[PDB]
Amino acid sequence: KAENAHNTPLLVLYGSNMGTAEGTARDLADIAMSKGFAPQVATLDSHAGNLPREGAVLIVTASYNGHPPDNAKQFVDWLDQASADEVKGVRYSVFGCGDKNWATTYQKVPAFIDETLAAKGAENIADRGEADASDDFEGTYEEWREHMWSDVAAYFNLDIENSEDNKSTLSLQ
Amino acid sequence: FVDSAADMPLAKMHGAFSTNVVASKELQQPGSARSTRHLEIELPKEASYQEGDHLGVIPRNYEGIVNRVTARFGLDASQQIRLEAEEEKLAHLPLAKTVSVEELLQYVELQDPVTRTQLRAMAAKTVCPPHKVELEALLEKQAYKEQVLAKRLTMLELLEKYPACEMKFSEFIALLPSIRPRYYSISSSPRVDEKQASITVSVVSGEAWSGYGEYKGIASNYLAELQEGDTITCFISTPQSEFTLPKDPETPLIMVGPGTGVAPFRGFVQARKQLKEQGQSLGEAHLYFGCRSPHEDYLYQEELENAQSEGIITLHTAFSRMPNQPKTYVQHVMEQDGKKLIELLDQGAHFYICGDGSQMAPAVEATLMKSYADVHQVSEADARLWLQQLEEKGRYAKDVWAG
Amino acid sequence: PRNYEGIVNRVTARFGLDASQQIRLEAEEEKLAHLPLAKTVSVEELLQYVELQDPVT
Amino acid sequence: KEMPQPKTFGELKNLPLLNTDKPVQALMKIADELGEIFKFEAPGRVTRYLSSQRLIKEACDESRFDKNLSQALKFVRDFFGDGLFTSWTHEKNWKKAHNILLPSFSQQAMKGYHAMMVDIAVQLVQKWERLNADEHIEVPEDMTRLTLDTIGLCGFNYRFNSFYRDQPHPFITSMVRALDEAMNKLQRANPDDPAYDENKRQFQEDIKVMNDLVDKIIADRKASGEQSDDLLTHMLNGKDPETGEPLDDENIRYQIITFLIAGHETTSGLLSFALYFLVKNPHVLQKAAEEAARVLVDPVPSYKQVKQLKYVGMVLNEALRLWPTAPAFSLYAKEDTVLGGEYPLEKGDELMVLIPQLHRDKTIWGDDVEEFRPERFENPSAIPQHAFKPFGNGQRACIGQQFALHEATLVLGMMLKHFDFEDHTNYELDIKETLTLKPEGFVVKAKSKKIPLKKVRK
Amino acid sequence: HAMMVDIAVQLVQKWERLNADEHIEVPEDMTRLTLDTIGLCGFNYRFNSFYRDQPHP
């Protein structure tokens, strides 16, 4: 049956070519479920224009040589030129998957999306987060996450008290 | 007797098919302290490939590391057992089936750094109070970066360090990540044999940065130990960044590919050689190759020297460790040749780099830009914009790795 | 019972097989020989289903 | 500007234009003739029919327009009540039910319906596997068996057992009769002429058959040791986080009827149109069949596998583009306002969005709008806002969109894996209107691929 | 045998799929099963009696 407190709407979108960003996204949606949300996971360029005007939208994306992943291109283009259909009401947050090994393009797509979303009417509830695959990606991912839940916590409602291990959900043989 | 292979999930996720090794041999010289392997693989009717494609290899964990696990848990390799959870599992384990320990152990990564979830699980089963304090110390941001991630300290090495951590096998296996494929740059051209592909594999080996004995890279040592007639599970992968020869064989090429970086250029060389044999004319093609020594790791020397003799390439070598010579790297040679290389790029050459992406590629890139700046008397910013434009025209391609 | 290692190795040696080689059988015909058919199973475990030292028939 | 208006009939104005068995198709022909906007007047009533994305994008501005009950919907409220479909946005029961029932269409809920969808889909594949040589398939009839059973089972743990019946289920017979009557009513000049006394009587008796079934579902559940963690569980047990209140008994009954109808009829239509377009486009059929074979490797499809069926998805959205099965929705002006810089509206003025015409706007889609080309949907991001609206608009959009699409995708995927299809009659499209749209008389033959079995021995 | 099982599985499924408090008309369902069984086993012909609400014509 579970306990289903919040149940607030958390939509998590990813831009991924090799699955790092996609697994991070699905991980987030898994911890949201533990924090009573009503999470939804999908690619970025599939909600192109259909940003949620309620709850919040976590945006997890990589960069490829300064460009969006194959499942995120439609989103960004829609975001870049198209601005008319303003992004007002959309309370979001952005997590960046990047590699320091990519010099001048480091986290360019997450950054683009983050700041572009804001120069269009942002409800940026939680400052962007970055992961460097070339160092401590789980540290930063961890920092951004804990800070993140709280930012959105205080913002709206107050569902999990300590995950209350709504986590340990082994299943084995 | 479907002598058949697990079609483990990942093999299905990558479209990896099962197939035979037709050749496997050493490329370095007798007495080299290091190894680089050349493997030839057969492909089934349904598969096909192109120059600059990668072979995706689903590897197996070697015996040494499997035995370390069964020893730590006091288990026999052949002990049949059955798992179960109810909960999802990126760890892509056969659940509700009976399967030996040793075969369960071919589904998981055994030497990824220890994760924070893994550390907590161990702490919770530890009845050594000071040992629990230490495992928890490792959870802190700084310690985790410096002692876990920097040294690639694994769960397995910590279980060996802590024999009275009461974690059990079935909890171990379930906390591990699913086994990942490894990519290798196909080193042959399909213009020579459409149904046969080669790879060129540097063998990872050294003292473990964690301090626990000797380290062996999983796929590379798996590949190194295969022999003619063995089977192998793989798939063809095409990279998002195109890495192919120009459409016109008179368009000039510059290739930089030291060490195993030569791999994809061996395919380029084989392609050009067939095009010639079909009456096509070939333009200039410079191959910058670097290694320690011709007495050690000058991979495919004979082939590359023959290619050069048949006018398929012009070969430029750099040796880091020849007695009585300066330590030389490809970028030093490139820099001597700056004028010529930049004129070529002004006439429409493609430039390619393959091999090490962490140190070699950036230094090669810096030398190319500096050659530009010096030849055309422009700023470093103009030289950077030039390279940016070259890449956007599709004329500056990388097949580099941190591995 | 199980067949001992010595006698299992004599069989895999005679056929040039590795103990661990996974394979799959099939017939269509009945089988007092009570073999896992249409399943993949190593050679060595197949060899624990049969009598290896009955007189030759 | 003054807006165009179709031909008039003296004091009846445009009313007699609706005296036809196919009134949406008639309206579509009027749109092609008159363009992006026309006025439609009846005695005492006016509405404005919109067909261009240019105007419809403005109609979809929720700060300026809200959902209206069209005449059609006002007649269907007679049995749908203040359920989600026929409640005004400002009625307390709308937002309460929206909030209580939206969690039944969450991702976790969807995952948990999968097994039951497979149950019904396996029943449809089996019926077809079990036909004799040269027998044929009544497509929309079988699609209705499948869709009604799927919402019955997934939503309510109730088995209509439609595949055990040779005629349509009684609930379907009265549904169709009730929708038909609502549709025929649209054209009636004098709805209280006693000539319609029998119509009203048949209407109430059909409303009764539908409500008798609702009563049974409720009784089963009260018996249902019920976790049946489904839509009905949420109806009877959920509280709205805003008011803190659950749905009362009267509203729950309207919800059940609403979800039983909206929850199947238009999905049946979509599958029927999708099979129609596939058999008429053999290269598209083969490309979809190729994907099904490639993706659906196991004996029954998984949830993640259905999500892998991209081209099948494209096929369905293209079927909805040409023949959106709920083909109209209605809006009212919340305040005085100007549409398109040229058409002044007063507060309360009504608009109709004529979805099949929107879906044929050449400025959006290009000149070839009558062709069936799923490739149009290869990147759905590319489609402009408010250009493709088969599931309505905004907070009043289809609650069940993901459920319909998951079901359709699963079913069509299985059909394409398991059979080859033949349009053996060279069927001429004939579109039956019951407010909703569906092919009538569409038949095919299905030759099993024995996913291969032919085996000899003798 | 296999074809008998086909029809018998159809009868078990019909009954598994009834709702609470629904009942079974026994000789009616036994006739669906027996006619279909001889139709299929004897003649490779499917009367499809379990897809019919009345008796087959």
Ligand SMILES: Cc1cc2nc3c(=O)[nH]c(=O)nc-3n(C[C@H](O)[C@H](O)[C@H](O)COP(=O)(O)OP(=O)(O)OC[C@H]3O[C@@H](n4cnc5c(N)ncnc54)[C@H](O)[C@@H]3O)c2cc1C
């Ligand atoms: C696109 C691409 C193409 C590639 N092409 C080739 C190719 O053609 N040929 C080739 O040889 N490789 C190639 N690689 C690298 C290759 O895929 C594998 O990564 C490489 O063979 C190592 O994998 P492994 O499983 O043997 O070692 P793993 O078990 O995965 O271990 C790899 C990790 O161990 C680390 N490590 C190394 N030494 C130690 C040590 N002493 N102690 C602790 N940790 C250590 C490495 O830094 C790396 O992080 C390519 C990679 C990519 C992404």
Ligand code: HEM
């Ligand atoms: C292809 C199938 C479907 C189509 C084309 C369709 C279409 C629509 C449209 C056009 C509307 C808006 C109506 C308006 O604005 O007046 C709507 C609303 C609605 N739909 Fe669907 N629908 C489909 C499937 C379903 C399913 C499967 C369910 C139930 C599981 C369902 C339940 C509803 C509900 C309850 C509403 C009213 C929502 C609200 O206003 O709160 N639909 N639908």
Ligand SMILES: Cc1cc2nc3c(=O)[nH]c(=O)nc-3n(C[C@H](O)[C@H](O)[C@H](O)COP(=O)(O)O)c2cc1C
């Ligand atoms: C070809 C290539 C180009 C990349 N370019 C960039 C880049 O421009 N900026 C960056 O921050 N990281 C760059 N990266 C690093 C990737 O973003 C990092 O691996 C990301 O974690 C991959 O995420 P994904 O698997 O979801 O696609 C690049 C990686 C590759 C393979």
Ligand SMILES: COc1ccc2nc(SCc3ncc(C)c(OC)c3C)[nH]c2c1
């Ligand atoms: C002239 O007036 C008309 C005519 C036809 C119409 N068809 C419609 S479509 C109305 C509709 N939409 C969606 C659903 C889920 C639904 O459930 C059965 C119905 C009846 N409105 C019309 C209005």
